Every structure is written in C-alpha cells, then in structure tokens.
C-alpha cells in the first residue's frame, strides 16, 4: 500500500516526487524503461566528459532513444531484387507498421523515450516562460492575479530546474551574434540568452539539468533523507487504472513487471499519470476513458469525451548559416597586427582599457592569445569558445519561439568542410490552434511493442492563422538569419517532419469546466469526476504555444501538488 | 598504495580484476570514461527490454561511442556559399583533424570507446577460438603441448564470458540458413552457430555478456565479497608510467582526475595496461617506450623498438540478401492448406510425428500457429522468430571468418520496404600479414582531446597473400550468399572502410624473444626488461587472424595472471 | 534546365521555379587566363579562372537577392522539398 | 522545337547537360578507401581525367561550360531577352 503512485520518471513525474516525498508521503514511482544514465539516476546523458569533448556524437544518443509513435505501411517500390529472392505481390503490413495510420495525416516525427528520466536524459534544456498569449488561464477575470500566480509557479519551477540566463555570457560567438541581432532590430525586438536548465562548472563543461536535478530518484529512507519514503520501480509497464462503479475514484493500478513477466495490482490513495503526452492518453483509453478505436461520433464516450482531441504540435523550421566575413573581421577589430603569421616578428597586440576598443579586455585577451598561439589558424575565435545560445522570445508581432546557436540534435550528416566556429543553427517554432478534429487515438485491433493499443494520429496543421503564421515564420527565419551569414549548403531553410519537434500538447487538456472548455483535467490537474486521479505533462496544455512546453508543464504540476498536500493526509512513518 | 593497478575497465582489464581480486590482491582500476550502463556497472547496453524490442535502434548507441582515431584534413570543395559568408582560401587544419595523417594510408574507420566496460558495452559477443594457423605459439617445438595449453586457457575464457553455441537453436531462420549451407557444402565445409558470449533468458530476450559478466566492477569489500579489495575510479585519464633509471621496474602511474582537474601519482607493486590496442600504445609512447613522433629510423628507439609496428587490421566485406522463394516455401513444406486465407473455412494443418515431415513438431507448430493467427501475413515465419547466427569458421581452404545473420551494427539507413524476416547479413573477415612498415605512431606536436600525443596510422593492406585473400574472400561471399538469396539493393557486396571492423592487433605484440620475434611482451604478457609491467588486449596478438580477437586476448590475460600470482605476494588485508 | 532529379510526387501544375540573377562589379583581379603548358581537348591553351565575387556591393546584393527571393516566393507558396533556396555553382 | 520535346519537356534537361562541357575542372582529391586490396591504388591525387592542375578549386567558376555545336548555346537556351536599363548598360 502506498500513499501516492506516480507513473513515469520524466521531469514531470519527478516534480510530483520532489513535492510529495518532501511533504512526507509514502511514494512509489514506476517506469516502463530502465536506469540508464550512470550512478546519477535519471540524469542528462550529455554530462560526460567524453560527450562534452565530442558533442557532435550526442545526436546518436538522441536517435537511439526516439522510438517512432506511428509508422504507416510502406509502399516503396524495390524492383531490382534478384529473380530468385522472395518478392511481395502487395504492400502488406510489414516491420511493425501501423495499418490504421493515414501517411498523409500523421505526425511522422513523433517519437517516445522509455528510459528512467524520460526525454530529460537527452533534451536541450531550454526553459522559457510563456507570455499571456500562449498560456492557459489559472484565474478567471483577473489578469493581475493570473500573472502573479504564474509568476509564483514559474519561479519555483526555475529553481527546481536550475534555470539561468548567464551560463554563455563569456562566449565570443554568443555575444557576436547577440549584439549584431540587437543592433539590427534596434527597438523593434529584444534578444537574450535562451533560458537554460543548466549550471556551468568550467569554461568547457556545463552540467545540464534533467529529471535527476528535480529529484535524485534514490530510494528513501536513506542517510541523506531518513524520514522520507520513496521507491522507484523500473522495467514496469503500467497498463490500466481501475475505476469504481461510480467513476468517482481510482481503486488500483494494474502493472506488468517486465523482468519476471508477472502482472500485479498496486493500491494507493492518490494516482498520478506522468507517462508523457502520448502514453498518458494510451493508459487512460486502455482504462475506459475517452473512446477506444477509430473515432466514431455516433457512439459518444462515457467519460472524458475531449481526451485525445484538440491535439497540438508545433511547426518547426530550420537552417544553418556560415558567419559573415564582416562579423568575423569584427571579432579582431581591436587588434593591431604587425609582421606576418609564422614569422619571429609577428605581433598581435591591443591596448587594455583603451576607450576606443569595441570589446572588453577579456575578449581581446582571448583573441590575442589565440592569434599568437595558433598562427596557422585563419580565424580569430578561440578553439574552445562556447556556442551561441540566442533567442528573441515569442511576441504578438513575431509569434514564434526562436533558438539560435548550436544544438546537439543535428538533422543530417554533420559536415566537416566548413569550420565549426562559423556555423550557427536557426530553429523557429510556431504555435498551433487547438482543433477538435486533430486527434490522437488508439487502435482496438493493432497493438504496439508492449501489447497496448497502437497510437494513431489524425492531424493536419489548421488552415487559417496556424498555417499563415508557419509560412510567415519561415520567411522571418530567412530574413533574420541573413543578418548573420548565408545558408550552409546542406542545411537550407526547411520545415521539419511533423512532430519531430516533440512539443505535442493538448492530449488530456486542462480547463475550468469539462464541457464549456472541452477538457479533461481542471486547474489542479485533477481528472473531472475523480477525487484521486491527476495527470501531469504537456498533454495538459490547452493553448496554442510556440515556446518549449516543459517549464509550463512543471509549473502546473507544482500547483497540482499544492492541491494534493491540502487534501490528502500522508500515512505516518 | 595498491598491490595492483589496472588501466582500463574493458573485458581484458576485467579479466585481470577477476583473477587478481579473487586471488586476494588489493586492486585499483582506472578508466578515462564513466559509468554508463545502468546499475550493472560495465554491462552490455543492448540488455534493456526496450533495445531488445527495437533492435534496429541499437546502431545509434554504437555510433554514439565510436570516436574516430585519426581524421585527415578535409579538402571537400563547397563553392555555393553566399558571397557574404566567410570563405576559406586554403584547406586549413579544421574541426580537430590530424594534419599528420595521410588520407590514403589510414585506417579511417578505426575508433575508440571511452566508457566503463569499454567496447564490451556494445560488442556483438562473437567469441570463436583461433585454430593453429591464426594463433601465436605458447609452447615451442611441441604442437600437442601448445594445443593443450590453448585449450585450457580458452576453456577458462569461455566460462568467464559464458560462451555458448546453442542460444539460437529454436530459431526457424537460423536453422533454415544453417541447414541449406550445410547441404550445399556437403563434405567440403562445416557450419555451426557463431559462438556467442550470451545467455538466453526467454524466447525474446538474450542477456548478452560484457565486462560486467567477467567482473561486476563493484567496489570491495562488500557483503558478497567481504575479504576482497577492489576500487574502480572512473573519469581518470592515465597519462604515463614512470620508469626507474635501470628500465627494470615501473615506480608510479601518473593520472589526471577529470572531474577535479588535478594530477596525482599512484603507487602499486604491479601495473597492468588494458587501455585498448591504440591507447596502450599511446600511454607507453608517452612514457618513453618506442619512439615519439614521425618514424625516423636514423634514431633507434631506446626501449621496445617494435612498439607500434607490425600492426594488423582485418579486411571486412559485407552484404545483405533477401531470402529465396525456394527457402521460404520450404518453411511450410509440411503444411496442408485448405480454403483461402481470411475465410471461415481456412485450415492449415500438419501431422505431428509423421515420418514424412521435413521439420520437427515444434517448428511445424510455430508455422501452423502463425499462419492461422495472421492470415493477412504472406510469410510462414513467426514475427518473433530470432535471427540467424551462422558461421563457417576459418580454414586453410577458406581463410576468413564468417558471420551470417542479423547484426545490430548496420552500416546504412535501415530499409523498411523488404520484410525484415527475409533479410540475412553476410560479414567475411580476412587476416592480415604483420609487416614492419605498417605502423601506429604518435605526433610530437598535435594532441588529441585529452591532451595526449595524437594517434596517426601509416597502413596499407600488404601486397601478396593478404591482398589475394581479401579479394578471394569477397568472391567467396558472393558465391556463398547466392545460395540463400540475391543481394538486397542498398547493401550490395563491398569492402568496408579500413578499420571499421575494430579488430586491430599487433600494436604491442607478443613473442618469445624481443629481438628475434620483433616484439614487446613475452608469453606472460610482461614487457621485456620490466619486472612489474604487463600489457593486455588485442595489441598483444602478433599473428595474422581473421576470427574475432577478444577471446584470444582474454586467454592471454589469464596466462599473464598465472604469472602474477606465482611471482607477487598480495598485501595482508 | 532542372538542377536536380525531377520529382514526381507533387503535381507539376502546382510547381513554380524562382531564379534571381545578381550583377557583378568588374574587377581587374577577376581573370580568365590560359595555360602555357596544359592544353584542352582541341590542343589549345587550357582556360583557367581566378575569380571570386567582389566584396562590397556585389556580395551585399547577392545576399539581399537571396532574401528577396525568399520573401517574394512565399507569396505564392512554400518551398518544394528538394529545391530549397540556394546559390548555384559559380 | 520537336513535337516529342514539347510533349516531354522534363527530358530536355538532358540535351542541355549533353552539350555543356566544363571549362576548368580542378584536380580531384576525393578519398576512396574501400577499393579491394588487389586494385591499383593511387599514392597521390595526381592529374587525372583531364583535370586542370593550374586551377585553384576555391577561385573557380566551376559551373562554366561551353557548347560546340552549329548554333552554339542558342540550340538549348531559354530564350529570355530583356533590355538592360541605364544602370546595367555601357
Ligand atoms: C527528445 C527531446 C525532447 C526535448 C528537447 C530535445 C529533444 C531532442 N528539448 C527540450 C524539450 N522540452 C523543453 O521544454 N525544452 C527543451 O529544450 N524536449 C521535450 C521534453 O524532454 C519533454 O517535454 C519532457 O521530458 C516531458 O516530461 P514528462 O511529461 O515527464 O515526460 P517524459 O516523456 O520525459 O517521461 C515520461 C516517462 O514515462 C514513461 N512511461 C511511458 N509509458 C509508461 C507506462 N505505460 N508505464 C510506466 N512508465 C511509462 C517513459 O519511459 C518515460 O520515462
Ligand atoms: C565496438 C565494437 C567492438 C566489437 C564488436 C562490435 C562492435 C560494433 N564485436 C566484437 C568484438 N570483439 C570480438 O571479439 N567479438 C565481437 O563480436 N569487438 C571488439 C571488442 O569489443 C574489443 O576487442 C574489446 O572490448 C577489447 O577489450 P579491451 O582490451 O578491454 O579494450 P576496450 O577498448 O574494450 O576497453 C579499454 C578501456 O580503457 C579505457 N581507456 C582508454 N584509454 C585510457 C587511458 N588513457 N586511461 C584510462 N583508461 C583508458 C577506455 O575508456 C576503455 O573503457
Ligand atoms: C546553355 C544556356 C545558355 C543560355 C540560356 C540557357 C542555357 C541552359 N538561356 C539564356 C541565355 N542567354 C540569354 O540571353 N537568355 C536566355 O534565356 N543563355 C546564354 C546564351 O545562349 C549565350 O549568351 C549565347 O548563345 C552567346 O552567343 P554567341 O556569342 O554567339 O556564343 P555561343 O557560345 O552561343 O556560340 C559560339 C560558337 O563558336 C563556336 N566555337 C567556339 N570555339 C571555336 C573555335 N575555336 N573555332 C570555331 N568555332 C568555335 C562554338 O562551337 C559555338 O557554336
Ligand atoms: O528538434 C526540435 C528541438 O529543437 C530545440 O533543440 C529545442 F530546444 C527543443 O525543445 C526541440 O525538441
Ligand atoms: O563491424 C564489424 C563487426 O562485425 C561483426 O559484428 C563482428 F562480430 C565484430 O567483431 C566486428 O567488430
């Protein structure tokens, strides 16, 4: 018997653990995946010395733990098999493909991660706040009270993730790009560092945050926490929550232990589902919420008719640029050069403190030292200079989020012919109108690898504002990137495969009133009708948003925990 | 102060730990990489439920931890940059490339893995014995005593790795391929399962062996081993062994703790270097063995003049095939079919025990059940049927090793249009003559990511037998694969990039006499001249071999440990 | 004059090509010259270029032209995958 | 101007490519390291395949080409004939 059971060990589940273990609840957490990050359980995989010395190899870790949600049946024609080889007469259902899926109405890039820590073991760590325009209301009819509530929640979430905006302030490339974009949009747009869940430890090492940062996932009691009670159970697939006949209370969680193969029931006072935007919806549908199978309006769901509808995913555009000649030359604007590189007489100098200098002394020292120590190198930027981490946040006149820099998630072969110091990535993220017709649903016939109803999307970007903005966003990325340099061949401006962005929302959405706001949970993230069932994650988010959603989801989880602590008493120890 | 210090936590270092911790030595082990496999330290990364349900994603884990040894300067021409972008006038030294490296005399595919467990956290687990032709002598002038010694050693190594030849015996595809190849080469060649370091736990889960299997890398004393003494120190780069002035004894190991940044010296009675074929050679050269810098014969080395010479790497050829129509039809040879798939009347039947049946009842039951339960599927092979794991081992008349089946290390985009059940991989491995001119050496100017002398290869496959065999091996793979099916478009028969195979040998080679056998260690793997310095790994192997080398290296490590236990006394506890 | 494999999956009636051509400042240093050693297929002095797009106006305009093509083309439709905005080989 | 090309216009690119002979091709330095050991293998990037050793690959007009047929490049051209305005005109 536990006080609270949490399904999923991603950062949102760890938010619940942090708050409830700390408040003295007896907590169990289950994860279908396994411990995978070293001795820091659920930590960021990029925090090894080896990955921070070979960052271009990290894309492989990401790709290795993104398992595609819904792959349609393949119809590629191979007509150069040998006559002796067994040959298909039809495009039959092969290789785990989903026959329910329309290839033309998919989120083909959507994927899920089944490891302890969830997708926080690989994520970029970007944690912006949403402005009013992107954010669901927590207080009706009082914009100042709503602002104050979200400020309170986001402040606490930022502390849990160790969000900061200064970790890249000593990068030449960062400040080169930042300053040029500030000057070019003088008094039309503001630029700043991407807020990042991270702490810099040295000039060449950043400790990126994760689920581990939020809660260390060690079992409790232990020497550091002798009065706390927590157990993590990895390799456990959670399959169903059992409803009482009144549909007022959940009575148990049915699980499948993957190592013994056996099935069990787990009893708790409070049940929290933080399995991710797809897998929360799967578990709930498997439990008699929403509607199983291909949508059929003639059969209205008994419970939560909005579950799996109004789904949102962001449009994503991408390119890379090669820094302009003008920007490169500007890096060394304060240097006087005498003699010729490689000779005994070569001298690069600057006057420290000189009021005519364009750059601070620390910048000038770095550039001087690089040029004198590497006289065969043609660029003024030091070899270990960190990457840019630049944004202009979403605003009404540019309603997309932006990340400008270097991202470990590369989308094609990494090029080696252009110096990496010259390269700047551009990712612009659009917001998507929630529409009833956009759905995530689950097959009543086809099953996935864990023997659960197979996820199927029926999605297109809405006509009207969503589509108009997505194309305006593309243009904006072309216009803005040009201020820094021309496009890198091989990374020209493009829309990314739908869902690759992994910012899926609205699958179990939040609102004030189940019927009027077409929603599944209230503002304490409690499932309507049920006293002791709560849902956490981006699935809660009911709005059209362009910024990265995790911080917002954590803020909602914090608020849900306030509700729990005010309404359920922990067992005595 | 320790009794023994081991540099490297790969399977060969763990062999030394297993033997010496067990014998009561006070042991320290250092690894430049970090704990990365879950709570089983140094274990195989493929042993998660998720990877065994999504095996096509494991290639990403492999690629994510293969860091290229020597990348020549890039000379690709990009002439479609925007005029405003900074543009090179020369192909200057960019992106960590090695200017010492001749791109035409490289092992471009050679790579290293810096993680606790080393490359055993990702390897295929194939552990064949070498026959006489491929194997260095351990006893002179007595072929029967040599055979008995290697049998003893290999038997013990097989126990440490849990090598078996039966784990795939219940696979339809395995036995289909195996039986056809046996019939086709009747009395010319023998086929069997690839010997694999593994234990099957269920029909859909195999516990693949690793360094963890050999030694669990837990610190000791602990409850399970109260009288043993072992400490593992991850994130420690070992940089040099200090020689006494006599060059008779090593006095300390100089290390760089990567997390504090500080440097220390570690004292031990016995020093073992198991850093891998490349990094053992690097450490030794950094320590005044062999010759630093571009080879210069006019300056004979003081110590170990053969170090880094006589290097060997295997030629590798690869293709994939699509199973023949004839073989597929043969799977269902014992079935009687009535009616038509999908109808109420459809019936697939066989007579159990019938003396006219070609297959055992268990096979027939599987095929019957698949066909009745999946009447939309056009193939007779069950969806969860395991892959083939087939070999005909190296022999004088076919002097290459062979692995026929499914390998997680895919070399290109994984195709989805041909049913995976039809696909069979073919890898043939050639042996390479050891030649003085083939070298691994280390720059006296350029450094790698850990501030150590940069590895550089000077390698070509020797003219004569090596080259003749490599091309005959290619032909043999074409001839043999055709018996199973035609080539898969996209995986046509090809030589793989030099070194991709990662079977590098001979870098610190073994023999009886330093001078006469052009070698670095004797048959106890002791460095000539030095009482207390031993080298372990494939670098020891002095012969031309085609089979996978790890089992052989472990067998040599076992023998080296016998020497240690007979000549050094453990401290009292 | 198509520059890559011609696609067949999008209806050709929907497809519109965009080519924008910049002007280039004449500069003494930009040259076509002929080898005194190497000959071509007709046994004539081998042509050799020594060319870069001039810094200054030529280069500024070429990048502004790229932007202009992005801005204008967007009024008609989004880019065709496989034919994204690019400078062509000199 | 054949009936066949105006019914199959996507095939005309082949006529163009078939009569554009590259003016100056620099020496090639691509690394092929998967030849069979038995195949003859280069030790250097020597002057091969009619390449021009005088040409700097980084200061080229690599796409420049010439057409040697009666009618010259007018047997394949696009037929676009705008006037230059003052700004562009000698
Ligand atoms: C993969 C990715 C993700 C993000 C970024 C980059 C990359 C390449 N960058 C990023 C993100 N979000 C941001 O706000 N900023 C950034 O810069 N990414 C998305 C972010 O990573 C996710 O939004 C976040 O983790 C969501 O947290 P969560 O709601 O806790 O969900 P997770 O998926 O992380 O963890 C869920 C969890 O539950 C498990 N599981 C799933 N099904 C079950 C069942 N049935 N039983 C038990 N357990 C279950 C998973 O295994 C998983 O660990
Ligand atoms: C990567 C690969 C490797 C193998 C196969 C497949 C793949 C894709 N399959 C395979 C192999 N061998 C076989 O016999 N059969 C198979 O089916 N592969 C090769 C095998 O994996 C290696 O031969 C084997 O691990 C060698 O063992 P080792 O001699 O113990 O060396 P490792 O490289 O595994 O571990 C060395 C170790 O030391 C560390 N390190 C390196 N430098 C230092 C320094 N300077 N200080 C401290 N520590 C150091 C590494 O981090 C590493 O962990
Ligand atoms: C190939 C190309 C060219 C043009 C367009 C499209 C394509 C794909 N489109 C285009 C053009 N120009 C425009 O104004 N608008 C358009 O829409 N293209 C360029 C145009 O095609 C050329 O500018 C034009 O023909 C130039 O005319 P020209 O000065 O008469 O030169 P040509 O190259 O056409 O013909 C010269 C000619 O002389 C021959 N030859 C060369 N060397 C010798 C020697 N040594 N001895 C004797 N004869 C020689 C050639 O064989 C050739 O026929
Ligand atoms: O691939 C798209 C990704 O790009 C950036 O890395 C963002 F930080 C992230 O939130 C997102 O998932
Ligand atoms: O890539 C080549 C590889 O192919 C097979 O997997 C072998 F088992 C392995 O020893 C080798 O390293």
Numbering used by the authors:
A (entry chain A), B (entry chain A): 46 to 618
C (entry chain A): 454 to 543
D (entry chain A): 92 to 181
What does the paper say about this structure?
In this context, Trametes multicolor pyranose 2-oxidase (TmP2O; EC 1.1.3.10; for a review, see) is of interest since it can oxidize both β-D-Glc and β-D-Gal to the corresponding 2-keto sugars, which are intermediates for production of D-fructose and D-tagatose. TmP2O is a homotetrameric enzyme produced by lignocellulolytic fungi and has been assigned a role in lignin degradation. The reaction catalyzed by TmP2O is of the ping-pong type involving a reductive and an oxidative half-reaction. Therefore, to evaluate and compare the productive and competing sugar-binding modes for oxidation of Glc and Gal, we used crystal-structure analysis of 2- and 3-fluorinated Glc and Gal derivatives bound to the TmP2O variants H167A, V546C, H450G and H450G/V546C.
The axial O1 of the 2FGlc α-anomer is stabilized specifically by Asp452 Oδ2 and Thr169 Oγ1. Besides the axial configuration of the 1-hydroxyl group and an additional hydrogen bond to Tyr456, H450G forms a similar set of interactions with 2FGlc as do H167A and V546C. When the competing binding mode (3-oxidation) is concerned, there is a clear difference between the more “wild-type-like” variants H167A and V546C compared with the variants carrying the H450G replacement. Since the structural integrity and conformation of Thr169 is crucial for proper wild-type catalytic activity, its involvement in coordinating the O1 hydroxyl group of 2FGlc in the H450G variants is interesting. Conceivably, this interaction leads to unfavorable conformational restriction of the threonine side chain, forming an α-anomeric trap for Thr169 that stabilizes the competing 3-oxidation binding mode, and may prevent the substrate from rapid dissociation and re-binding in a productive mode. This is expected to result in an overall lower turnover rate of Glc 2-oxidation for H450G and H450G/V546C relative to H167A and V546C, which is also the case. Based on our crystal-structure analyses, one possible explanation for the lower turnover of Glc by H450G is an increased stabilization of the competing 3-oxidation binding mode of Glc through an α-anomeric trap involving Thr169. Since the enzyme needs to eject the substrate bound in this nonproductive binding mode in order to bind it productively, increased binding of the competing 3-oxidation binding mode will effectively slow down overall 2-oxidation turnover of Glc. Thus, the competing 3-oxidation binding mode would act as a dead-end enzyme-substrate complex that effectively slows down the catalytic cycle.
